[PDB]
DNA sequence: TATCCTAACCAAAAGATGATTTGATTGAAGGGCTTAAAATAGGTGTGACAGTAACCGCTCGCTTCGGCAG
């Protein structure tokens, strides 16, 4: 039941999705953002320490 | 007033933060090798041997069966 989450159809061997389609390619040319770009992760103190070390 | 903001705080979604439990990895040991040699004692199967075996474009010569001969 939980295996049908997005992408709905995923490659069974590799998990890859289909290649870029016409509509998506034209959208990317037009520079329209997607709903997956708004996912932003807060900085954990662990992450801050790692970046200081880096 | 009807309604709201969102300072500081309560109920819930989500978003996150470290301690703990379970899926997963492996370090070391059971184990069971190696050729290298030297040796007596052995069993036979088998794989050469060998044999037959079998299966798999132009121009002459030569011939016959009747139509008159005898």
Swiss-Prot record:
It is found in: Nucleus. Changing residue 44 to E: In NEDRSO; uncertain significance. It is linked to Neurodevelopmental disorder with motor regression, progressive spastic paraplegia, and oromotor dysfunction: An autosomal recessive disorder characterized by delayed motor development and developmental regression after the first year of life, followed by progressive spasticity with gait alterations, paraparesis, and oromotor dysfunction. Most individuals have cerebral, cerebellar, or basal ganglia volume loss. Part of the SNAPc complex composed of 5 subunits: SNAPC1, SNAPC2, SNAPC3, SNAPC4 and SNAPC5. SNAPC4 interacts with SNAPC1, SNAPC2, SNAPC5, BRF2 and TBP. Part of the SNAPc complex required for the transcription of both RNA polymerase II and III small-nuclear RNA genes. Binds to the proximal sequence element (PSE), a non-TATA-box basal promoter element common to these 2 types of genes. Recruits TBP and BRF2 to the U6 snRNA TATA box. This is snRNA-activating protein complex subunit 4. It comes from Homo sapiens. The chain holds residues 142 to 195 of 1469 of the full protein.
């Amino acid at each position: 039941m939980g295996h049908f989450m997005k992408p709905y159809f995923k490659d069974k061997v590799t998990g890859v999705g289909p290649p870029a389609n016409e509509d998506t390619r034209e959208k990317a040319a037009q520079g329209i953002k997607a709903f997956e770009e708004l996912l932003v992760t807060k900085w954990k103190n662990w992450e801050k320490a790692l970046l200081r070390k880096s």
